[PDB]
Amino acid sequence: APPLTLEGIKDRVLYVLKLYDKIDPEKLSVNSHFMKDLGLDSLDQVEIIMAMEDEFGFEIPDIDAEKLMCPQEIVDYIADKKDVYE
Amino acid sequence: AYLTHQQKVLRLYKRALRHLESWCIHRDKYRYFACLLRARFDEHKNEKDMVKATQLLREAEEEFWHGQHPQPYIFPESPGGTSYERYECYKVPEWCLDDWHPSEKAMYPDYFAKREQWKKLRRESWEREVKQLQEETPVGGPRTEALPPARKQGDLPPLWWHIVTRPRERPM
Amino acid sequence: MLKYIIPTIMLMPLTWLSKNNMIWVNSTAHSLLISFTSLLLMNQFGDNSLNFSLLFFSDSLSTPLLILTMWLLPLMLMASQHHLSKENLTRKKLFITMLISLQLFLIMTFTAMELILFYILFEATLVPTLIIITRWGNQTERLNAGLYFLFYTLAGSLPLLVALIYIQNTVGSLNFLMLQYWVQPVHNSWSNVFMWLACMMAFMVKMPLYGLHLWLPKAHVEAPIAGSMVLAAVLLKLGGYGMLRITLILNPMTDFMAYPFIMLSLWGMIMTSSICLRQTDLKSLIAYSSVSHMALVIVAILIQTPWSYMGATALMIAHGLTSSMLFCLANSNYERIHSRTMILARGLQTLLPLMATWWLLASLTNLALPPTINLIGELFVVMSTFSWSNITIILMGVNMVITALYSLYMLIMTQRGKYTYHINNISPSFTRENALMSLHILPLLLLTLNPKIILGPLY
Amino acid sequence: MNMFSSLSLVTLLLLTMPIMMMSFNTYKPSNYPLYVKTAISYAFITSMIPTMMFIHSGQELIISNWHWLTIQTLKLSLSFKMDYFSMMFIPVALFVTWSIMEFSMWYMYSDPNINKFFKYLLLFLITMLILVTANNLFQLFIGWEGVGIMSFLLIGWWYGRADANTAALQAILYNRIGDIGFILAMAWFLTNLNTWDLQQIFMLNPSDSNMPLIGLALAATGKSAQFGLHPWLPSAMEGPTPVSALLHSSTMVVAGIFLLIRFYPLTENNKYIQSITLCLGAITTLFTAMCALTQNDIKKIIAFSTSSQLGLMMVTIGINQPYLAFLHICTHAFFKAMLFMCSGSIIHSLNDEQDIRKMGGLFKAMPFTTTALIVGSLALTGMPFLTGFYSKDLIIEAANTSYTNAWALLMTLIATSFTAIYSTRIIFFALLGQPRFPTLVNINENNPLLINSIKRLLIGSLFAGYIISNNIPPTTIPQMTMPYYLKTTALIVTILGFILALEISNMTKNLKYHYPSNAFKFSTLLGYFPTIMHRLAPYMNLSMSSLLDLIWLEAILPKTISLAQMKASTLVTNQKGLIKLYFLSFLITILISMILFNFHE
Amino acid sequence: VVRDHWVHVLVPMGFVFGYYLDRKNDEKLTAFRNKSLLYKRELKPNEEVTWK
Amino acid sequence: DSWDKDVYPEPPRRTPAPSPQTSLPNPITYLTKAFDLLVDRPVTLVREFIERQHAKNKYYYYHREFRRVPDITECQEKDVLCMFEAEMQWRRDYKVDQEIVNIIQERLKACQQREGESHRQNCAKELEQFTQVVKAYQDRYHDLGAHYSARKCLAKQKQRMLAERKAAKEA
Amino acid sequence: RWQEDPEPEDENLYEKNPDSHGYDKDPAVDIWNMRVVFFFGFSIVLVLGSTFVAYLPDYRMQEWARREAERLVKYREAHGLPIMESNCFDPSKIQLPE
Numbered sequence A: 001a002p003p004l005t006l007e008g009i010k011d012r013v014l015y016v017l018k019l020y021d022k023i024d025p026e027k028l029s030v031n032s033h034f035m036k037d038l039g040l041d042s043l044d045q046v047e048i049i050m051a052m053e054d055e056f057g058f059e060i061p062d063i064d065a066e067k068l069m070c071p072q073e074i075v076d077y078i079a080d081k082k083d084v085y086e
Numbered sequence B: 001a002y003l004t005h006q007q008k009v010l011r012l013y014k015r016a017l018r019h020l021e022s023w024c025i026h027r028d029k030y031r032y033f034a035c036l037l038r039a040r041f042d043e044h045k046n047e048k049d050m051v052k053a054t055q056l057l058r059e060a061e062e063e064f065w066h067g068q069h070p071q072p073y074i075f076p077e078s079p080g081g082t083s084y085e086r087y088e089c090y091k092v093p094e095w096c097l098d099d100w101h102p103s104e105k106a107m108y109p110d111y112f113a114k115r116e117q118w119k120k121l122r123r124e125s126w127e128r129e130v131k132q133l134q135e136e137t138p139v140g141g142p143r144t145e146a147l148p149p150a151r152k153q154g155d156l157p158p159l160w161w162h163i164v165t166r167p168r169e170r171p172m
Numbered sequence C: 001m002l003k004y005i006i007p008t009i010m011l012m013p014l015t016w017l018s019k020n021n022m023i024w025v026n027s028t029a030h031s032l033l034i035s036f037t038s039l040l041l042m043n044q045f046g047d048n049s050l051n052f053s054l055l056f057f058s059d060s061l062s063t064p065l066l067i068l069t070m071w072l073l074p075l076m077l078m079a080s081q082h083h084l085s086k087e088n089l090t091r092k093k094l095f096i097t098m099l100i101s102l103q104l105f106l107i108m109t110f111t112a113m114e115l116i117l118f119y120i121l122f123e124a125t126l127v128p129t130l131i132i133i134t135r136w137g138n139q140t141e142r143l144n145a146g147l148y149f150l151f152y153t154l155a156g157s158l159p160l161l162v163a164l165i166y167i168q169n170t171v172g173s174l175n176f177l178m179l180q181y182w183v184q185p186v187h188n189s190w191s192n193v194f195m196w197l198a199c200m201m202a203f204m205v206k207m208p209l210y211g212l213h214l215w216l217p218k219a220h221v222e223a224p225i226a227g228s229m230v231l232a233a234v235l236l237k238l239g240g241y242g243m244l245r246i247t248l249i250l251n252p253m254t255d256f257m258a259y260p261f262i263m264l265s266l267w268g269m270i271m272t273s274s275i276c277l278r279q280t281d282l283k284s285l286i287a288y289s290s291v292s293h294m295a296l297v298i299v300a301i302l303i304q305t306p307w308s309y310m311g312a313t314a315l316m317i318a319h320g321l322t323s324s325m326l327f328c329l330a331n332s333n334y335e336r337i338h339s340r341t342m343i344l345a346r347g348l349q350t351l352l353p354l355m356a357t358w359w360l361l362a363s364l365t366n367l368a369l370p371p372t373i374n375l376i377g378e379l380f381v382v383m384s385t386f387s388w389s390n391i392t393i394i395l396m397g398v399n400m401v402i403t404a405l406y407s408l409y410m411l412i413m414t415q416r417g418k419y420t421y422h423i424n425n426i427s428p429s430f431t432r433e434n435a436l437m438s439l440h441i442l443p444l445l446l447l448t449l450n451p452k453i454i455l456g457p458l459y
Numbered sequence D: 001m002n003m004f005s006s007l008s009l010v011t012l013l014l015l016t017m018p019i020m021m022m023s024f025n026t027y028k029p030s031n032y033p034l035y036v037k038t039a040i041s042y043a044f045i046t047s048m049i050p051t052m053m054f055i056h057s058g059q060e061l062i063i064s065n066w067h068w069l070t071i072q073t074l075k076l077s078l079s080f081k082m083d084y085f086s087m088m089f090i091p092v093a094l095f096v097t098w099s100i101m102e103f104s105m106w107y108m109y110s111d112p113n114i115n116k117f118f119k120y121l122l123l124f125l126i127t128m129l130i131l132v133t134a135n136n137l138f139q140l141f142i143g144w145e146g147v148g149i150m151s152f153l154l155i156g157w158w159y160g161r162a163d164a165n166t167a168a169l170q171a172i173l174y175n176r177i178g179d180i181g182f183i184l185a186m187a188w189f190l191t192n193l194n195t196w197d198l199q200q201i202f203m204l205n206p207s208d209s210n211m212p213l214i215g216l217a218l219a220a221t222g223k224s225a226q227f228g229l230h231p232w233l234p235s236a237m238e239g240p241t242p243v244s245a246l247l248h249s250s251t252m253v254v255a256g257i258f259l260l261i262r263f264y265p266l267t268e269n270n271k272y273i274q275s276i277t278l279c280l281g282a283i284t285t286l287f288t289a290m291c292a293l294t295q296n297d298i299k300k301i302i303a304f305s306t307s308s309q310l311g312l313m314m315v316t317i318g319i320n321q322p323y324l325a326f327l328h329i330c331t332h333a334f335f336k337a338m339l340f341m342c343s344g345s346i347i348h349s350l351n352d353e354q355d356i357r358k359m360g361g362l363f364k365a366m367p368f369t370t371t372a373l374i375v376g377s378l379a380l381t382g383m384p385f386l387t388g389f390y391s392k393d394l395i396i397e398a399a400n401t402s403y404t405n406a407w408a409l410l411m412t413l414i415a416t417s418f419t420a421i422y423s424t425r426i427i428f429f430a431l432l433g434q435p436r437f438p439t440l441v442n443i444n445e446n447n448p449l450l451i452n453s454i455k456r457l458l459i460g461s462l463f464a465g466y467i468i469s470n471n472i473p474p475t476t477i478p479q480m481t482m483p484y485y486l487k488t489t490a491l492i493v494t495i496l497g498f499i500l501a502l503e504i505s506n507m508t509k510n511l512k513y514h515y516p517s518n519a520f521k522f523s524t525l526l527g528y529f530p531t532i533m534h535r536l537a538p539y540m541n542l543s544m545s546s547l548l549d550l551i552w553l554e555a556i557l558p559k560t561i562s563l564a565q566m567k568a569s570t571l572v573t574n575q576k577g578l579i580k581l582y583f584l585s586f587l588i589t590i591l592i593s594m595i596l597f598n599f600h601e
Numbered sequence E: 001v002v003r004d005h006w007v008h009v010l011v012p013m014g015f016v017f018g019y020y021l022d023r024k025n026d027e028k029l030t031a032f033r034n035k036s037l038l039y040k041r042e043l044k045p046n047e048e049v050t051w052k
Numbered sequence F: 001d002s003w004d005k006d007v008y009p010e011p012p013r014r015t016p017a018p019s020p021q022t023s024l025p026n027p028i029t030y031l032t033k034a035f036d037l038l039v040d041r042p043v044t045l046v047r048e049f050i051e052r053q054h055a056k057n058k059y060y061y062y063h064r065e066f067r068r069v070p071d072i073t074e075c076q077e078k079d080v081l082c083m084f085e086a087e088m089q090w091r092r093d094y095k096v097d098q099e100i101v102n103i104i105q106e107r108l109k110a111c112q113q114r115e116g117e118s119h120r121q122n123c124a125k126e127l128e129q130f131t132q133v134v135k136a137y138q139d140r141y142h143d144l145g146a147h148y149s150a151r152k153c154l155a156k157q158k159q160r161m162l163a164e165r166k167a168a169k170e171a
Numbered sequence G: 001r002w003q004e005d006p007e008p009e010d011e012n013l014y015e016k017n018p019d020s021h022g023y024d025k026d027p028a029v030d031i032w033n034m035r036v037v038f039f040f041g042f043s044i045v046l047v048l049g050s051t052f053v054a055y056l057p058d059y060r061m062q063e064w065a066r067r068e069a070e071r072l073v074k075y076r077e078a079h080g081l082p083i084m085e086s087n088c089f090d091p092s093k094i095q096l097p098e
């Protein structure tokens, strides 16, 4: 499959978040905490991870998923697993 | 279980949604039921009696076991998926490069020059890394598997080599 | 046979008078020449055996064993010279001297025309073998392994000596050629029952027969590689060769005395194969594999049919080369990880790709893939044992299923899966190690092109 | 005979030179896969010349060129039987193998061990031709076990995967249990007829063939994955898709049927064996088609289709129609190998996705894959006048106009209906609807290697049945007089299967939520046969290793022997060193010497 | 001849010596040379021993 | 030809003449002509050159003829010198008789292939001759054992002869 | 506790000799020992030994027996005698008990 890049991963991670109705696509930034800033709760965070899993076609274990609390953390996690260094 | 009640509910939620997605298949159908399922969790989200909440969870687990898909969807590279461990036969450890014949190492003069620098960095950092762990581990040994970050500048995080230098997920 | 005995003895002066750094070069070079000349033993005739003199003769049963014996000496020197590299020079020469003396006794054992001469040389092999195990073994338990080997063998041999001397008294001769014409039937009596047991129980122990097999896993686990190669390849075959010669004078009593020993071999082969599935030690797995393979030879020798003796002959040669190869393969790993645990070093095909091809080839011969001589020998025993009683096909068939299971399981455990992370001293295979395996597998596969020369005198 | 005999051997010799060059290493690995693909394409052409000679003048010959070994009165030779079955299977096998290797040049392009992969594919084909052309059971046994080992090395291609090692060993386990029957046959034939050569077996024509034929039936069960020894074939989907394509078409799985066709002069006079094989095939075709109804993995659906088809071939053996069973082997080879290649095209384009639930909307996105997949599904279901019609349609008419088990017949018709149901399942979920795959679209199917390889098999799936059915000589009286409702049975039930499957497939779009029935789980979990047997049988065997044995042990233990010697030693040596006691014992020795033993008398 | 490589004749010489001893032993076993019922024959013009 | 047709007989070959009923050209005809020119001619030329080298060097080898010697029935008990020659003679006969059964089996197998679908009726003499030869071989050698000998062979025959004597005395 | 040498660290022949064949620490001996093994082992025993075995003269008179068997079959069929007669020994030379 065609290779990924750090900016490509960040573009798609936000793209998915921008299509979620509980998030304000204007307040969204790579460093927005899903809990403190975006006002989401534990249950919404789970669905965000599932959306990223469906986006990139691979599973994030629950032990790792619960710690991804801002979009940048998700981007960093994906790059580490896909060996993306751009 | 090591997991808190809060962690247990979330794992069930993610597990329940995934098995629901296997049943529905069609995305529009899955969306309709996923929202109904989220409603059931949202109904008791504010329950404050931990005997009732614990009961609600246990009953939910029993319902999931009765309703689980016998053949749920698995991501191809997840445990049990059709591509799990497919590439382990291509992952060669980096220490194998030490045994290369000189003529083999001569074809990559620049890769093997960079490799030596990393080996030097590993040799020079090791003693500090061992010391940092000794003077941070409580008497009796560690209580968790969590390792510390580096504190000083020019210090590398303790026990980093086999994490940094691990094979790529598509090594060939 | 003096064209082979004298050259073999000359290996002793050659080793002792060789320059210090040349002991392994000279002994290996000249032991290969002796192996080359051993092909002259294949001047076999349809009717008469090759009877050189009053002391020694060769027929189609001893010739393949003689060629196997002399081929093995150069292979044991290659396998030995690594782990002895730090040994004292004189003790290196004594180790090589013990191997040379073992070949000397062995080639005379297989050609002796007099059974009491056979017994003395048959029993003389104990001394060099015992010394090799206990002196150059690496663990504490090598001393107990020495005693078990020693006293299991003598427990059966001493009754054998009495029976042979009794037979010469009443028949007048123990010359094998004479016994072919002067043999008389053995009638039912308690006296003849114990004469039968004495004549056979020494050979059953060396096979080994299931029940008397527990000395073999001990010896293998504790012996050095060269001790394991000779023990598996040739020394086990002494029992089979003795049984193929002695059964001539035990008829017709073998008709009913065989039954308990066929039952032990038919059931024993299923249990030893099953045990191989749960062995944690690699050398111990291969040892229990030999017990399973040699149980076929006992059954074949005891039912006494033309097809069963051809099968048993092929099995002994084929198993000799295969079992020796497997031990050398497990030794190559041991010289790296210094352990015999099968589960310790995994996923080796990734790190040693060519050595993984040798493992595959050795395993396929062990499970007897057609048309290898391992299958040819195994098949002929199955065909004849089916005629003996149709029900045996079930036990024979089951054993082939289990034999496949543990042969490939040993291949999968050590060669496939993920490699062990912390083992980082798996250096590339040496030219010495690769040549050692090719010298087992190439001759083994070449014999498929011309298997008649390993099918014995009933071919 | 000079051109016929010479050219039928160069075909086999040509397949081995690529093997010789790799082993002899005088080749050029610059493009080894193309070299192996070229060798097949030429071997296919050279094998057509002997076939045309057979079609023309019915020519058949046996070649016994090398005397290998004599065993008293049993002489073994390298012996090749170039007859009806050999001359028709070889070109079909080579033609399909030609397509699979061309497809493999694209599918396995990024595999670092591609050269070894093509070496194993070629050896896998070489052993199948040894099996097909063998004139005696020993040479046949070489091919029998050859394909078994090559299946092991190709199913477990990704040897880092634990499940690939489990699946590879499971193929060996089941096929080796089948070989118990094969060894049984060779033992009976040697004992009772004095031969392993087929000419003598047929000439002596044993009347009492219950034992040798059950041995061959048990051998065929494992190799062809009939009920009882069936699970390994679905598990063989661990290997790369080209392995599945070649494994399931023109190599291993039809060797079991091909073995029973070789021995039709015996089975045609044994009604007991015909009943056993008919019922064995009937249960196999129903059971594995029922499992396919609810599988979500595309390769497993096609894999269970093959088991279902192999059951139908075994049914044909049962109703004493050896040549129909052979024609179905040839026709099934085309469209089955194409379906596996069409599935590989989808899997490759969806980034190694195999679950059908995450496909959809591919009808227009993958036009050529879609065309071949519809032709393949129509050929499989027995659409009039496609490759599969010329065998399946004949077989069903023969079965229901025969003196046969009524239950076996019914189960073969129901399974035929199921074939339409799970063919609709693949088409409906893979191609129709809305896309369900991830967002980053990488669908591309424009490689000429992919297109050409499927294009050639597509053409075979259309006309091959017609071409073969019109060129083979007739060897039976085909029953062509029957009621309208027996003539049209296969078409009708197949049509009902399409209708019924369409309604259920459309039934999944509704906003209803349902609990799995016991029936649904039973089919989904493959009847629980793998779940139970693969935990119970390994556990009983791996954990498998009275007072009478206590005596036989405690008494004869080396500890017992060695510990009694220790007691006796201590009694002998634990003395006080006293002159008084030693001489007192001298007195006792003398007294009992005279009083008790009369040594002085 | 070299003091380096004189030990390389011990085993080749052993073969020749052993081969010669083997031939001599055959001389002690000529009791039936040209006397077996299967093989006895009259002697050729210059023959003196059918084998040796 | 090159073997004795009497030992390995073959019925005369009857091949029908071509009688095409199609305007099309037979592909086999052209392939035959190409095979003859491309394959047969160069292969024949190489052979003829080789057979010219052989002609310049013609030497001979012979089939060993064994004189007959007294059987085991004429050997005094425990007389090894006479027993040994009768035993070697018996073993050569045993190995020869194994080959006679192979010749007859070869005739039978060749017949079954040659006749085709008519083999059941057309291979009755080969089948009959195989049945008779296998009977004789079985009576001679079957059940002797791995350590067989002329002595054991004789003892088997005597037991058979006594049984047949009682067969005639009984009727 | 008591005076003893510690176990020496295991050594790697490739460390000081990347061309090592594994036979010896001395490169000159290491190459020599390789050549005697490969030459005598492969060039001589396996190649010549296999050629020698291929051309063994009529090992155990298997070819002679066939030639003789052909001669007897030709004779007995021409003279009308049975190809093989059940009695292995001439019954005139036997004297049954009783």
Ligand SMILES: CCCCCCCCCCCCO[C@@H]1O[C@H](CO)[C@@H](O[C@H]2O[C@H](CO)[C@@H](O)[C@H](O)[C@H]2O)[C@H](O)[C@H]1O
Pocket: C144, C147, C148, C151, C152, C155, C212, D557, D558, D559, D561, D562
């Ligand atoms: C079955 C047919 C042949 C049987 C022959 C049996 C005769 C005995 C042979 C072995 C003799 C060994 O003699 C002695 O045995 C015991 C155990 O057996 C060994 O001792 C070992 O086992 C014993 C108890 O099992 C332990 O207490 C001891 O710690 C352990 O070292 C001795 O180290 C050995 O010197």
Ligand SMILES: CCCCCCCCCCCCO[C@@H]1O[C@H](CO)[C@@H](O[C@H]2O[C@H](CO)[C@@H](O)[C@H](O)[C@H]2O)[C@H](O)[C@H]1O
Pocket: C188, C189, C190, C193, C257, C260
């Ligand atoms: C590994 C263990 C193997 C165990 C094998 C067991 C085999 C058992 C063999 C039993 C046969 C023994 O031999 C049998 O006994 C005696 C010999 O004393 C013979 O008979 C002789 O002694 C008995 C004494 O009871 C008298 O009745 C009889 O008058 C006399 O002729 C039998 O005719 C003979 O057939």
Ligand SMILES: CCCCCCCCCCCCO[C@@H]1O[C@H](CO)[C@@H](O[C@H]2O[C@H](CO)[C@@H](O)[C@H](O)[C@H]2O)[C@H](O)[C@H]1O
Pocket: C151, C155, D559, D561, D562, D563, D565, D566
């Ligand atoms: C079939 C005939 C076979 C004949 C074999 C030859 C017999 C040789 C007998 C040697 C016996 C003496 O060997 C001696 O056996 C005892 C067995 O308890 C061993 O005893 C071992 O286990 C016992 C308890 O089981 C311990 O108390 C002891 O500390 C330990 O050494 C001795 O370590 C060993 O020295």
Ligand SMILES: CCCCCCCCCCCCO[C@@H]1O[C@H](CO)[C@@H](O[C@H]2O[C@H](CO)[C@@H](O)[C@H](O)[C@H]2O)[C@H](O)[C@H]1O
Pocket: C019, C021, C022, C025, C026, C029, E004, E008, E012, G028, G029, G032, G036
């Ligand atoms: C018919 C039987 C034939 C048997 C053939 C056996 C072949 C064995 C080959 C061994 C070859 C060794 O021959 C070798 O020659 C050289 C000079 O001549 C000797 O001397 C050498 O010593 C060292 C090596 O240790 C060299 O660095 C030095 O340059 C050289 O002087 C060696 O000490 C000797 O080992």
